[PDB]
Design brief:
The structure is a homodimer.
Chain A: E1 3-9, H1 15-26, E2 32-38, H2 45-54, E3 57-62, H3 71-81, E4 87-90, E5 102-105, E6 111-112, H4 114-120, E7 126-128, E8 131-134, E9 137-145, E10 148-153, E11 167-170, H5 171-176, H6 190-195, E12 205-206, H7 208-211, E13 216-217, H8 227-234
Parallel strand pairs in A: 1-2, 1-5, 2-3, 7-12
Antiparallel strand pairs in A: 3-4, 5-11, 6-13, 7-11, 8-9, 9-10
Helix pairs in contact in A: 1-2
The structure holds uridine-5'-diphosphate-glucuronic acid (2 copies) and manganese (II) ion (MN) (2 copies).
EC number (chain A): 2.4.1.135
Organism (chain A): Homo sapiens
Membrane topology (chain A): Single-pass type II membrane protein
Chain lengths: ~240, ~250
């Protein structure tokens, strides 16, 4: 079972760092295909280079978003999976029709345990699991009773009150529902805008030992202070722009 | 050449997430021994468990941190004490390499980002090696200026008085050198920013620094920091008696 990891990314100071640790984590997972989609005007040498040197099975996609982020990027990754092309690097050919697999939307700053991926390979339709440090809670996750989702441990308002990092979708189910995609105009409702097109919340498949284990965390990275850089810039002694960071 | 990675760590909401990605990055490096030092009263089930399941070669150490607010000093000096034969292991490999062993010591904080490439750069260190660190000291990257394969200055701005204006993540030290310099340790009384110099000054002169990472033109490590999680809702849910299940480790 191949896991297709859809990751939207964009240029900012910590981008490479984020992509370095994420790709390093992904290199630990077998049968994984990374669909990295840049939110840019064109492919950046930084991303293209990072990908070429990652040694991972990947497909490079690009699409600019002129409010929810990473939407147009994730939707383009979906278009590719549905055979509508759009690849600028890596494996240009999408999985053939009727190919088995599972799609997982992994943002570039979260922390993913390697165990997480083994949990989602068995996804029939859509599976769910708790996500740590998100929604203002220690963890947010499905309430399970006798192996069935009977509710959700959440504090914010949503038929699918789960974070992007808390679910995976079987590839066949996404191909069967050609219209299923994220709504770029959807506010906490991004995840639902996709899932509503696929399953009923009561049919979600709980993983992570019936949602008793946190295997992914919604970590965020601090924005680096650049006061000293600006100062050195004024003196014409800024950090060499030819040295990538 | 085995790399001994010294990492001080303490319990806080993001701790496990940090140790997870770090341990996952380290599992990518061969001949690496992780010296994970907990800032605690004793080994914690969280860290002990993570280490056991990591599959890494490690030694679990523990020491509590007793104005400038130096961080991880006691923990780092504890890993040094262990390397110097003073014991203190609570798990993993109990015995340190015997004198004469070839290796390199690297002080990796638990929140930075490390490319697997960085470790091959430091594996060959005779005395003290150096390279640029990204997003630290208020710069895109802070690092040594290299001319003719030798360090001839530093690209830095913050606390320029530092004889070694380089972040903890920007250098590595030869194990034999550390054992040969028993007094070499981190100074808890040093000004904010002079922590690195407090150790290195007992080991070498900046001119003898070994520039790595293509003569310090490649940034292979970043001083990333993780945002403290917002817990307003958790606080509210607790009062109602429905706080996040405490039996689920995060
Ligand atoms: O507001 C939102 O739409 C996002 O809110 C939260 O995530 P959060 O950590 O707040 O947001 P980011 O980490 O900044 O962005 C999520 C993903 O979109 C990407 N992104 C962000 C910003 C941007 O301008 N372009 C872009 O592609 C990021 O690289 C990342 O992979 C959810 O976990 C995301 O799934 C959701 O997309
Ligand atoms: O002020 C300092 O002493 C630190 O400043 C910067 O790092 P920074 O990212 O600001 O600090 P932290 O990441 O919070 O701490 C560095 C290490 O010490 C550990 N630490 C921190 C705080 C604490 O109470 N206990 C403890 O073990 C952290 O887990 C981490 O591995 C430098 O990169 C660190 O080497 C230096 O120790
Ligand atoms: Mn995020
Ligand atoms: Mn740090």
């Amino acid at each position: 079972m191949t896991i297709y990891v859809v990751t939207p990314t964009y240029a900012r100071l910590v981008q490479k760092a984020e992509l370095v640790r994420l790709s390093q984590t992904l290199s630990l997972v077998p049968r994984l295909h990374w669909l990295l989609v840049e939110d840019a005007e064109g492919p950046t040498p930084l991303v293209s280079g990072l990908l070429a040197a990652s040694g991972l099975l990947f497909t490079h996609l690009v699409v600019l978003t002129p409010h929810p982020r990473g939407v147009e990027q994730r939707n383009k990754a979906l278009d590719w999976l549905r055979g509508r092309g759009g690849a600028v690097g890596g494996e240009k050919d999408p999985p053939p029709p009727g190919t088995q697999g599972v799609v997982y939307f992994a943002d570039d700053d979260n922390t993913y345990s390697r165990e997480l991926f083994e949990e989602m390979r068995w996804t029939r339709g859509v599976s769910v699991w708790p996500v740590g440090l998100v929604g203002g809670l220690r963890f947010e996750g499905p309430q399970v009773q006798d192996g069935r989702v009977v509710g959700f441990h959440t504090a914010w308002e949503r038929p699918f009150p789960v974070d992007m990092a808390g679910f995976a979708v079987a590839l066949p189910l996404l191909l069967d529902k050609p219209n299923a995609q994220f709504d770029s105009t959807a506010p906490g409702h991004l995840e639902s805008s996709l899932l509503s097109h696929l399953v009923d919340p009561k049919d979600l498949e709980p993983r992570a030992a019936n949602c008793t284990r946190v295997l992914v965390w919604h970590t965020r990275t601090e924005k680096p202070k650049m006061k000293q850089e600006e100062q050195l810039q004024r003196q014409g002694r800024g950090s060499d722009p030819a040295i990538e960071v």
